[PDB]
Design a protein around this nucleic acid. Structure first.
Ligand code: CL
Ligand code: NA
Ligand code: NA
Length: 326
DNA sequence: CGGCATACG
DNA sequence: CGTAG
DNA sequence: GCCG
């Protein structure tokens, strides 16, 4: 009854198993910090199955036959149903390793490998890192300076204000170019950190060279606190009552021929896209990315004019963005 | 056992 | 190495 | 960690 791939079932943003899914996601996150990518995927997939169920799990019986539930994930759920806590999860939460890796990887410019090296060197706090700007890259310096602002999510109303400023710059850079809101806000989030815009033009080829022109114009407006092409990872100045705050904004350009693929990828969720690409390759023999869908035996790319086309090509029922919260 | 998504900066 | 979804 |  429950399909095995997340892209085969609707997953709404809010659901009926929030506590269970959150606990499994702690174990997934911890597995990533230890470089255990297989275990991370399993725990993420198990959590996602619970998000897709139509009602709360109340008895261990209800996990039978659900994909991605084996001995370990079932034990986690059993303990939460019986006692309201899972000792393994609680041990992770209160561990110095988990807490410090989470803190450091939250910094823009710091991934698991850098965080782990710093951990092994004995560093534990943001002020530890600030006392040794020796080691830091320019990107990490910006991430550290803006960390407090970047830790607090922005509202959809903030996103709409940001979109108007981006549209103004994009219109000067290339009249007729369009701006689409992607990421979690397109999936229905009311607040988030993942402010993402996808830019195209209806005349194939006109978008070439566009992103530098957009970035130059946003910088001249004083809006860019940090930037380093077709993807730009920025920190922007967002107005607030009497002041402003830093916000992470990603700008992406695609030709219109690729726009449906880029829209699909950049709308997420992350797990949804990994599962969609896995399904494509393993079940349909087609290779999917954010630029296109390739048939390696005919050696041809699918044309798509819509996300609906892409789901049809893959033999999947269409899911609107709001149902891609795997 | 092998596999686990697939890109760009 | 980092970043994205 | 789980699936095929
Ligand atoms: Cl693993
Ligand atoms: Na990071
Ligand atoms: Na983003």
């Amino acid at each position: 009854w429950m399909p095995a791939y997340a892209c085969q079932r609707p997953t709404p943003l809010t659901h009926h198993n929030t506590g269970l899914s959150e606990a499994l996601e702690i174990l997934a996150e911890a597995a990533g910090f230890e470089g255990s990518e297989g275990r991370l995927l399993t725990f993420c997939r198990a959590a996602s199955v619970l998000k897709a169920l139509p009602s709360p799990v109340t008895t261990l019986s209800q996990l039978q036959g659900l994909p991605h539930f084996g001995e370990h994930s079932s034990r986690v759920v059993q303990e939460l149903l019986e006692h309201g806590v899972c000792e393994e999860v609680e041990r992770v939460r209160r561990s110095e390793r988990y807490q410090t890796m989470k803190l450091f990887t939250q910094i823009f410019g710091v991934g698991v490998k850098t965080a782990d090296r710093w951990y092994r060197e004995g560093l534990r706090t943001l002020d530890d890192l600030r006392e040794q700007p020796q080691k830091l890259t320019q990107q990490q310096k910006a991430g550290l300076q803006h960390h407090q602002d970047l830790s607090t999510p922005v509202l959809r109303s903030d996103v709409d204000a940001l979109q108007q400023v981006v549209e103004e710059a994009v219109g000067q850079a290339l009249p007729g170019a369009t701006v689409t809101l992607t990421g979690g806000f397109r999936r229905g989030k009311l607040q988030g950190h993942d402010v993402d815009f996808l830019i195209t033009h209806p005349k194939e080829g006109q978008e070439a060279g566009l992103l530098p022109r957009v970035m130059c114009r946003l910088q001249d407006q004083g809006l860019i606190l940090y930037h380093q092409f077709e993807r730009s990872f920025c920190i922007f100045r967002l107005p607030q009552p009497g002041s402003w705050k830093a916000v992470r904004v990603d700008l992406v350009v695609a030709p219109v021929s690729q726009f449906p693929f880029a829209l699909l990828g950049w709308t997420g969720s992350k797990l949804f896209q990994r599962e969609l690409r896995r399904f494509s390759r393993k079940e349909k023999g087609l290779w999917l990315n954010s630029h296109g869908l390739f048939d390696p035996e005919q050696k041809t790319f699918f044309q798509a004019a819509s996300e609906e086309d892409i789901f049809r090509h893959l033999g999947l029922e269409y899911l609107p963005p709001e149902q891609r919260n795997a």
